[PDB]
Amino acid sequence: AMPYTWKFLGISKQLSLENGIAKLNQLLNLEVDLDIQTIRVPSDDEYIRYEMRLSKFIFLGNSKMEVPMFLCYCGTDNRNEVVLQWLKAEYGVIMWPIKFEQKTMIKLADASIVHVTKENIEQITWFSSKLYFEPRQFSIEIPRESCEGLALGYGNTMHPYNDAIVPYIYNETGMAVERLPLTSVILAGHTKIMRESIVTSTRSLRNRVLAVVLQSIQF
Question: Does this UniProt record's set of keywords contain Cell cycle?
């Protein structure tokens, strides 16, 4: 139901994977598929986006940022480690595991559902939301419908969880999620966002999610 677990690594240098891919190919005895896209993420910014299919890798880079690029990967398959070590050897880059803080987890939740159409109209793919806490464990759940009626009554926001769901959880319930140890955010049949990883039902991540990840690791 939710098969794909993603791990995130920040990279000290921005990479042009086109210029080394043949060495990886000779290393693995196969021809990897490498897709390259220049993507735009409106705020109602531009990124270079690599995708490597062998188990999958996704790279997001931005030259006008201090920490210019990160990668994320899913599957296993130990060839992922081969890929990582190959990157470290071929490019001489420093890579570190990415851990998502609570605020960043909420931003991640917003990025997972919010998108913008051709005529710059905001749209939100709504799912039932489950907030998991661990100081002992307890969770709160807001069904899809309630979430939708919550979005409309705020109303227009690129951050429905931070602008609507959570403050409403304060007003009517009396709970400050910001004051509580949030360990997981579950969007039913879509995505689970944790501190150290993101799980998805599909074999990909929203571009907005990638953008939020890259923006979060800026020293």
Answer: yes
Whether residue 165 contacts residue 178, with contact meaning beta carbons closer than 8 Å, is answered with no
Phi, psi of 178 (to 5 degrees): -65, -20
DSSP string, 45-61: -EEEEEEEE--EEEEEE
- φ/ψ of residue 142, rounded to 5: -115, 110
Q: Which two tokens stand for residue 182?
A: 């949030």
Residue in the block written with tokens 């910001």: 178
Tokens of 64: 């006008």
CA–CA separation, 116 vs 211, rounded Å? 14
Instruction: Output DSSP code: residue 165.
Output: I
DSSP one-letter code for 212: H
- Cα–Cα separations (whole angstroms), residue 155 to 55, 148, 151: 40, 10, 6
Structure determination technique employed: X-ray
